[PDB]
Design a protein around this ligand. Structure first.
Ligand code: NA
Ligand code: NA
Ligand code: NA
Length: 312
């Protein structure tokens, strides 16, 4: 048999996964790779005559939008409910987180003592004026972070925080997270907010970056560090729904979690799978247990909040 995977991940990430599943089961896995937005738009327009069987995409915001657009079908999977924590999967069973990333604080340890750091909100303290850098608001990772901030602390408080962030910028918001981390390394930025896997990716490419850039897990005294996922669900109009389901269930297993999360310097979604050592070295941390689908429910609120605060 054969299944088709629509994937918002990099093609090189899914290539060994498709091959390893084909070797284990004999099923041919065809990967169709595109940006999350255009991919979901294609899946919606193909309708009942779609070739896709599985959707893999990034960020609870995009998974929520795929669910709202009606392109996924809910599945009752005993295996996925056991292997994936409830806060990392759709409450109505449309999709399942398969890798975990944290969006958290980074700092230059030659210029900032970690005792100076605590929460996302404290980055709006005037002591950070001219020292903070951020990635652009026009990005799902920042929409999701701000979306959970609104859920955890309210709209008024979040408006004040994000407005304080912008007042404290040392530079205009960067186009991507990696540019932001490299600007901390360059000395332009003393503190910033980005996804952990880019830091692992950057240290892998340039280990000396560690001299000027360190990770700090935010909000440990409160609800925990913001986390998000990449995830997968069975497409509503799949022609092989049972085989599509057995692929996602396998992705949640020990062997596939290594291939899927570790290779991109992300955390496994399955808590019985220990993080790769490059990632685990950063240390243990309390993560937020809010259901990451809130990243989508509050996405429009977040977009309006960042626009209102002048967060470009
Ligand atoms: Na602090
Ligand atoms: Na401020
Ligand atoms: Na929470």
């Amino acid at each position: 048999n054969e299944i088709v995977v629509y994937s918002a991940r990099a093609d090189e990430l899914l290539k060994p996964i498709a091959e390893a599943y084909q070797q284990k089961t004999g099923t041919k896995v065809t990967v169709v790779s595109d940006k999350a937005g255009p991919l979901m738009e294609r899946l919606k327009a193909e309708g009942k005559n779609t070739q896709a069987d599985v959707l893999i995409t990034v960020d609870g915001g995009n998974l929520w939008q795929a669910t709202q657009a009606g392109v996924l079908r809910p599945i009752n999977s005993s295996v996925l409910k056991s292997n994936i924590p409830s806060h990392l999967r759709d409450p109505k069973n449309h999709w399942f987180g398969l890798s975990v990333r944290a969006r958290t604080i980074f700092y230059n340890p030659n210029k900032v003592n970690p005792s100076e750091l605590s929460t996302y909100a404290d980055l709006a303290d005037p002591k950070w004026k001219g020292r903070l850098c951020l990635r652009t608001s026009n990005n799902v990772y920042n929409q999701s972070l701000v979306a959970t901030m609104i859920a955890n602390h309210g709209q008024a408080t979040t408006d004040r925080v994000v407005k304080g962030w912008v007042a404290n910028l040392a530079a205009a918001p960067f186009a991507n997270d990696t540019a932001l981390l490299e600007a901390i390394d360059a000395g332009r930025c003393d503190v910033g907010i980005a996804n952990t896997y880019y830091y692992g990716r950057l240290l892998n490419s340039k280990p000396q970056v560690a001299n000027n850039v360190k990770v700090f897990f935010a909000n440990q005294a409160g609800k925990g560090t913001h986390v998000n996922v990449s995830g997968a669900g069975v497409v509503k109009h799949s022609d092989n729904p049972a085989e599509a389901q057995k692929f996602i269930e396998w992705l949640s297993s020990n062997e596939a979690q290594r291939l899927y999360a570790d290779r991109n310097f992300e955390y496994p979604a399955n808590i019985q799978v220990t993080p790769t050592p490059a990632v685990a070295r950063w240390g243990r941390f309390k993560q937020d247990f809010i259901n990451v689908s809130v990243a989508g429910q509050n996405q429009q609120k977040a977009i309006m909040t960042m626009k209102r605060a002048g967060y470009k």
